Amino acid sequence: LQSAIKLEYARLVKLAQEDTPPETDYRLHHVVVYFIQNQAPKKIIEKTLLEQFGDRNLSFDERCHNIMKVAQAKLEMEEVNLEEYEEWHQDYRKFRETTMYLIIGLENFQRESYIDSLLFLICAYQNNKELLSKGLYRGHDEELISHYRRECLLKLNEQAAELFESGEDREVNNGLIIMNEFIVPFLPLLLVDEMEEKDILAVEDMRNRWCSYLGQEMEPHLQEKLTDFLPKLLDCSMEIKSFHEPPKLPSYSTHELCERFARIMLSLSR
Ligand SMILES: [Cl-]
Ligand SMILES: [Cl-]
């Protein structure tokens, strides 16, 4: 059947146009769905379909063997544009990893493991902005990732402040280590854009919280600690390293990707 590829392409177009609830994202099921929703050239899509049919070497199924030879025939026929071809498949692999960062970030947020959550959400947010640079359908819901990155910062800040309010030397030092390790270094990320008003207000809310302890009386060696810390939190400088190493992802199957995405989207309460 010289048209099995045309049948399959027409099926994926239909899948690509279906309206689906937030837990279901057929871009995670097939690279060609990602391509269709992102206006990939018809030729990029056909080559991807032909290679999915024609890449194998062996078959025990007469009908599939024949479809394999047909696809290998068309593929063997300047029109290749390999850099464009590799670029689209790299973009899809980045979409899958971005999804996996987001899932682990949201899973840990829901478990209230905010230290583990935060870096995944920050990485997901930044990768997602890089995807959406290239088009509207390249990535994930910006307002959702924006919401959880911001709420995860505020909850970790709450955790650090309540440690500080306890007034014990170990807990104060631990709270200040949280602020200096996980929060202060990423404050510039939430100030980059004046249009992102909720992020601006959240940075101001975190800064007010730590300043309001000036209005409280406490052990003076702790007051010296607060006094050295506050300039760090209130600093005007936007100095931030340009590359950050991403947290480690455990190996995962596409099956895991899709199912864990569905499961966290369905249990999240926002
Ligand atoms: Cl949708
Ligand atoms: Cl959806």
Curated annotation (Swiss-Prot):
One GO molecular-function entry: ubiquitin binding
User: Would the keyword Transport turn up in this protein's UniProt record?
Assistant: no
Induction per UniProt is: The muscle-specific isoform (USP25m) is up-regulated during myocyte differentiation. Levels increase up to 100-fold towards completion of differentiation.
Q: Does the keyword Nucleus apply?
A: yes
Disulfides per UniProt = none
Q: How is it modified after translation?
A: Acetylated.
An example GO biological process term is: negative regulation of response to oxidative stress
Q: Where is it located?
A: Cytoplasm
Question: Which keywords are on file for this protein?
Answer: Coiled coil, Cytoplasm, Disease variant, Epilepsy, Hydrolase, Isopeptide bond, Nucleus, Phosphoprotein, Protease, Repeat, Thiol protease, Ubl conjugation, Ubl conjugation pathway
What is one GO cellular-component annotation here?
Answer: nucleus
Q: In which tissues is it expressed?
A: Isoform USP25a is found in most adult and fetal tissues; expression is moderately high in testis, pancreas, kidney, skeletal muscle, liver, lung, placenta, heart, but very low in peripheral blood, colon, small intestine, ovary, prostate, thymus and spleen. Expressed in the brain, with high levels in the cerebral cortex. Isoform USP25b is found in all tissues except heart and skeletal muscle. Isoform USP25m is heart and skeletal muscle specific.
Per the entry, what this protein does is:
Deubiquitinating enzyme that hydrolyzes ubiquitin moieties conjugated to substrates and thus, functions in various biological processes including inflammation and immune response. Modulates the Wnt/beta-catenin pathway by deubiquitinating and stabilizing tankyrases TNKS1 and TNKS2. Regulates KEAP1-NRF2 axis in the defense against oxidative assaults by deubiquitinating KEAP1 and protecting it from degradation leading to degradation of the NRF2 transcription factor that is responsible for mounting an anti-oxidation gene expression program. The muscle-specific isoform (USP25m) may have a role in the regulation of muscular differentiation and function.
Family from the record: Belongs to the peptidase C19 family.
Q: How does it assemble?
A: Homotetramer, inhibited form. Homodimer, active form. Interacts with ACTA1 (via its C-terminus); the interaction occurs for all isoforms but is strongest for isoform USP25m in muscle differentiating cells. Interacts (isoform USP25m only) with MYBPC1; the interaction prevents proteasomal degradation of MYBPC1. Interacts (isoform USP25m only) with FLNC (via filament repeats 17-18, 20-21 and 24). Interacts with GAPDH. Interacts with SUMO3; the interaction sumoylates efficiently USP25. Interacts with SUMO2; the interaction sumoylates efficiently USP25.
Reported disease: Epilepsy, idiopathic generalized 19: An autosomal dominant form of idiopathic generalized epilepsy, a disorder characterized by recurring generalized seizures in the absence of detectable brain lesions and/or metabolic abnormalities. Generalized seizures arise diffusely and simultaneously from both hemispheres of the brain. Seizure types include juvenile myoclonic seizures, absence seizures, and generalized tonic-clonic seizures. EIG19 is characterized by onset of variable types of seizures in the first two decades of life.
Know the name of this protein?
Ubiquitin carboxyl-terminal hydrolase 25
Gene that this sequence comes from: USP25
